[PDB]
């Protein structure tokens, strides 16, 4: 459409991708350049033109938190406090959100993880549901990727829905562009206290 053409020529990644999908060269190259372009700084380190990071997190009636907002740094954020302040809860919330990107990079319409109906809703919340809202950034052509994971308490008649389509839409771009021409892909990883395990050399995985 003419509207998408204008936005795409203005540098909007989603519009460029939509035009690519409907006409299936120029638009493909736009999408691929958006992902792959970058430069080597004065220190000799490669820097992508379009960075990807979590900007903001909001927790509503999640575990200990009635309503909590966190603004994150693009490079390093350190959370401190006494035991039981919810430091681990915050990382768990983020990891579940990231699972939706990973699922959709692997498989079209893949399903990420969910909030627990048994444990994750705040015990004394009057409304018996919880929300984890995240906003991600991917360069100036995609300044906001909002995701919400939601869950209602066990045995509540009214069920609260998650909103994950933006995650899926971005992950689709990575998956489809990669299929045509190889690109670099984002790494998502969680290392919790479970990383302290006994080592066994002998037990070998036959699942892929």
């Amino acid at each position: 459409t003419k509207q998408y053409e204008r936005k795409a020529k203005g540098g909007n990644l989603l519009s460029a991708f939509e035009l690519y999908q409907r006409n299936s060269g120029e638009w493909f190259e736009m999408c691929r350049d958006y992902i792959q372009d970058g430069h080597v700084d004065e220190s000799g380190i490669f820097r992508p033109d379009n960075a990807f990071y979590l900007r903001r997190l909001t927790l509503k009636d999640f575990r200990r938190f009635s309503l909590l907002e966190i603004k994150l740094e693009e490079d390093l954020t350190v959370i401190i406090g006494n035991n039981g302040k919810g430091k681990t809860s915050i990382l768990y919330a983020i990891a579940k959100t990231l699972s939706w990107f990973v699922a959709n990079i692997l498989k079209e319409g893949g399903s990420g993880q969910r909030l627990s109906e048994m444990t994750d809703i705040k015990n004394d919340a009057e409304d018996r549901y919880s929300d984890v809202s995240s906003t991600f950034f991917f360069g100036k052509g995609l300044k906001s990727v909002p995701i919400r994971l939601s869950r209602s308490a066990l045995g509540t008649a009214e069920r609260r829905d998650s909103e994950v389509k933006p995650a899926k839409d971005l992950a689709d771009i990575w998956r489809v562009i990669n299929e045509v021409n190889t690109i670099n892909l984002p790494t998502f990883a969680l290392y919790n206290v479970e990383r302290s395990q006994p080592f066994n050399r002998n037990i070998k995985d036959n699942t892929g």
């Binding site: 003419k2 204008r6 991708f17 939509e18 309503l67 409304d127 809202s133 906003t135 389509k165 839409d169």
Partner: protein, 308 residues
């Protein structure tokens, strides 16, 4: 009584109005409109006969609307909304979730009952007809779920009315602490020159919403945004610049200049030309100074040729 009034306005029989209204909640066409990025919005428009009835109803019955309500108001718009906040340095935006589809017959009648300003009085017999006029039935099999649809001509008026008491209370509260407040449909805007007063507003909103609507209307917490002169400030698509003036924004202005340059060299197609003309009319409304500058930059003759 509502029937008799409508019949008179529409020059139809009481019987034919009444017969039409029996299945009026199902007389909606549903279609999709593309979003500006990826995806679609779902819209439900009433059938022509129903639209006529809805318009007649709104004509016959004046419902109160607060002055802070900027949307769907005669002689007001996005310019007036943005202008209300242009002099303040700190800005807060809040958004209501599923605003139109959250408004049910129950909410409507509660608001009628509660209303302070002079509400029309309806006979109990008329209540059922009014529900059939104003509310859409999305699910054929579930006769019990009636909701306002954005696409109906009556929905703006009803929604503004339902927010009347809300607007009264919050406006009064904000005025005591020197906060400017306006509402454009589901979009709430707060601005102030005093640091840190805006931080309390979101909590105040949640309490008030619960008080007035229970769990039916809720704040969208992901869409609650603080801003200042340190950052970009916009109100309903209009940029407020650091000189406290309304602006289209630098990027939009640069795009318009691009189009004009293309026109100067006879490169614009008719579709793009028509688009340019429309955008210049809007620009003239929001930022007349921009048009003056374009006239200076591009020759009055060129611009007149374009707009003629």
């Amino acid at each position: 009584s509502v029937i008799r009034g409508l019949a008179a306005v529409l020059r139809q029989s009481d019987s034919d109005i009444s017969a039409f209204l029996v299945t009026a909640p199902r007389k909606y066409k549903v279609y999709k409109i593309p979003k500006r990025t990826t995806g679609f919005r779902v819209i439900a428009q009433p059938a022509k006969g129903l639209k006529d009835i809805q318009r007649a109803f709104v004509q016959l019955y004046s419902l109160p609307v607060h002055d802070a309500s900027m949307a769907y108001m005669k002689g007001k718009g996005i310019r007036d909304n943005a202008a209300a906040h242009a002099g303040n340095q700190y800005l807060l935006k809040a958004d209501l979730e599923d605003f139109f589809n959250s408004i049910t017959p129950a909410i409507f009648w509660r608001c009628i009952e509660m209303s302070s300003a002079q509400t029309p009085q309806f006979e109990p017999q008329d209540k059922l007809f009014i529900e059939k006029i104003l509310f859409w039935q999305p699910i054929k099999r579930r006769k019990t779920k009636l909701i306002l649809s954005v696409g109906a001509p009556s929905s703006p008026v009803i929604s503004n009315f339902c927010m009347y008491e809300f607007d009264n209370r919050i406006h009064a509260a904000c005025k005591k602490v020197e906060i400017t407040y306006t509402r454009y449909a589901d979009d709430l805007t707060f601005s102030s020159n005093i640091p840190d007063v805006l931080k309390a507003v979101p909590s105040t909103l949640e309490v008030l919403l619960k008080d007035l609507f229970g769990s039916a209307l809720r704040l969208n917490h992901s869409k609650t945004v603080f801003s200042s002169k340190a950052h970009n400030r916009h109100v309903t698509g209009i940029t407020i610049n650091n000189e406290e003036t309304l602006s289209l924004g630098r990027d939009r202005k640069r795009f318009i200049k691009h189009l004009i340059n293309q026109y100067k060299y006879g490169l614009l197609d008719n579709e793009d030309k028509a688009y340019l003309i429309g955008l210049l009319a809007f620009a003239s409304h929001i930022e007349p100074s921009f048009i003056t500058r374009m006239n200076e930059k591009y020759s009055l003759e060129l611009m007149e040729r374009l707009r003629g």
